[PDB]
């Protein structure tokens, strides 16, 4: 069930001979996930700077081990990558002692788990570097060192945990991103299925930085923090089979509203002879708000379509209304109603919900467990046209006073195999075409793309 070590993986594949493939089989003690990935990307800086283009291939091997003894269990998954350039073989990868190598080894997960606090198999406590994920992917979808308690039953779901990055556990990245250094996350949620297939819930997340900012006069480089924060996200979420590709209902929906409160100390800098020097810091409250809404029409067993709107506040008095996400999110979810997860704000733009408004349209198709396809359109705007947006897959400056971020068309197409009841492999095309709007200004490329083919096999 939900405690299975691959439960959260987007692939949704089942190895031949596993207990999940046939319940008469014993749980596997080991396996191998093999991934071959090609990536073409051009041009992430919209032509404004040298580099930013990829046309490259790689292999990513992920052996894993699992043991189970009464209420105790334990899991390890390693990772070895070899590629022709530094492509993305991992949708959850650290965004980048921060220069990745073409080839590297990593310890992806390593945890121990105790399920004995209660008799519910959906209840367990997990300690170590582990996959944390909730269904929207907008709060947590990452591998991180954590102590996390899960409780999943028919009428009640709840979770609580703490997490913090201490290393990347990678042979090529020796340092943490500044945003992660000394940042502790505590989180939890409670929800209930108040009617068959409809859930309502509350969610909380708190991030606290124990690190310090550079002092005035000190040089500032890319490994220093830009701010320290104490931030709390408090949300309400309602869903009707939002992320369930097997739904029986004719309509599926999601609605969430999140209030971000707390305080940030923002480092100030100036440039002095081509160098960046700290000049001080300024504190201020944050009082910001995010919303994501979606409606999906299940037209028949195979065809679906829908619409989405999301907005993360921006700007405001001393920047207090600048919404931002936890930093643990992927923003990838099954929001098109298929077995494949899709980036909620574009495979190319990869928007974070921060000073950003997005309108989305999608269609999808699927056949049994054998195929799926999704076509997604997005239009993006800034909320406050004198404030930055958050992270994105585009490295180009925004022009003050322009709200038109751009538009994007994405296509995902997947074949599952090894008709197959429980597939053990897949081949997927995932592409996004991004058309920058007026916020990107003159001299930028008219279009940009990011496209992948992935072949994944689980043994
Ligand atoms: C060399 C990398 C570290 C050792 C990992 C080797 C894992 C191989 C395990 C796979 C076995 C499953 C074979 C099909 C049943
Ligand atoms: C404590 C904080 C970090 C978590 C530590 C987790 C380390 C776990 C790495 C282990 C991988 C899974 C299997 C190890 C034990 C397997 C074992 O000998 O089981 C006995 C038998 O059932 C099969 O060999
Ligand atoms: C090993 C480190 C532990 C850190 C966390 C401390 C745990 C303290 C005890 C927690 C208990 C949580 C269970 C509460 C809910 C139980 C429940 O609703 O019913 C359980 C019962 O009906 C079935 O056996
Ligand atoms: C070199 C950095 C430290 C290595 C040890 C990592 C420990 C991983 C297991 C920790 C789990 C709970 C962390 C919550 C804070
Ligand atoms: C229902 C089963 C799913 C069917 C899947 C069909 C796959 C279609 C794949 C198509 C890929 C390439 C599409 C053309 C690219 C056009 C393009 O880049 O235009 C750029 C230009 O318009 C910008 O001004
Ligand atoms: C259902 C069909 C959907 C897509 C159909 C159109 C064709 C898709 C072509 C694939 C594009 C992904 C781009 C990355 C592929 C890997 C790549 O560029 O390899 C470069 C080399 O092999 C290394 O030099
Ligand atoms: C700009 C986008 C277009 C406008 C969209 C407007 C959408 C309005 C937002 C939807 C509100 C969600 C209502 C909650 C759903 C669950 C509900 O109604 O009650 C849950 C239970 O009854 C609790 O027992
Ligand atoms: C343009 C983008 C916005 C479109 C989506 C807006 C709507 C999002 C969904 C939110 C609320 C819909 C109302 C919930 C209805 C479900 C419900 O209460 O069912 C009642 C119960 O009897 C079910 O069996
Ligand atoms: C279920 C039957 C098949 C799916 C039904 C339609 C859903 C798929 C359509 C999605 C994306 C394709 C591109 C749409 C272009 C949108 C566009 O240009 O919007 C107008 C533009 O002025 C900006 O608002
Ligand atoms: C089948 C279609 C159903 C879904 C319709 C789309 C979803 C709701 C659209 C409503 C509002 C979102 C658009 C906000 C636009 C704000 C805006 O353009 O501000 C900046 C403006 O100066 C243009 O650059
Ligand atoms: C019904 C299908 C609609 C087609 C439009 C989908 C847009 C998202 C996909 C993005 C880009 C094109 C995908 C096909 C392969 C692209 C590719 O290999 O580009 C090579 C690159 O060197 C282009 O110069
Ligand atoms: Ca470039
Ligand atoms: Na339990």
Numbering used by the authors: 13 to 108, 118 to 439, 450 to 490
What does the paper say about this structure?
A novel monoacylglycerol, 7.10 MAG, has been produced for use in the in meso (lipid cubic phase) crystallization of membrane proteins and complexes. 7.10 MAG differs from monoolein, the most extensively used lipid for in meso crystallization, in that it is shorter in chain length by one methylene and its cis olefinic bond is two carbons closer to the glycerol headgroup. Two distinctly different membrane proteins, one a β-barrel and the other a mix of intramembrane α-helices and an extramembranal αββα sandwich, as well as the α-helical adenosine A2a G protein-coupled receptor (A2aR) were crystallized in 7.10 MAG by the in meso method, yielding high-resolution structures in each case. These findings attest to the utility of this lipid for future campaigns aimed at the structure determination of novel membrane proteins and complexes.
The first was the alginate transporter, AlgE, an 18-stranded β-barrel protein with a molecular weight of 51 kDa that resides in the outer membrane of P. aeruginosa. Crystals of AlgE grew readily as thin plates at 20 °C in the cubic phase formed by 7.10 MAG. The crystals displayed anisotropic diffraction to 1.45 Å resolution with electron density of excellent quality enabling the modeling into density of 459 out of 479 residues in the protein. Two stretches of the protein were disordered (109–117, 440–449) corresponding to loops on either end of the barrel. The hydrophobic surface of the protein is coated with 11 lobes of density that have been modeled as 7.10 MAG. They are configured in a way that is reminiscent of how lipids that make up the bilayer membrane in which the protein resides naturally are arranged. The structure includes calcium and sodium atoms as well as sulfate and citrate ions. The citrate sits in the core of the barrel and is taken as a mimic for the mannuronate and guluronate components of the alginate copolymer. As was observed with AlgE crystallized in 9.8 MAG, the hexahistidine N-terminus folds into the core of the barrel where it associates with the citrate and sulfate ions. By contrast, AlgE gave rise to a sample in which the cubic-Pn3m phase with a lattice parameter of 111.6 Å dominated.
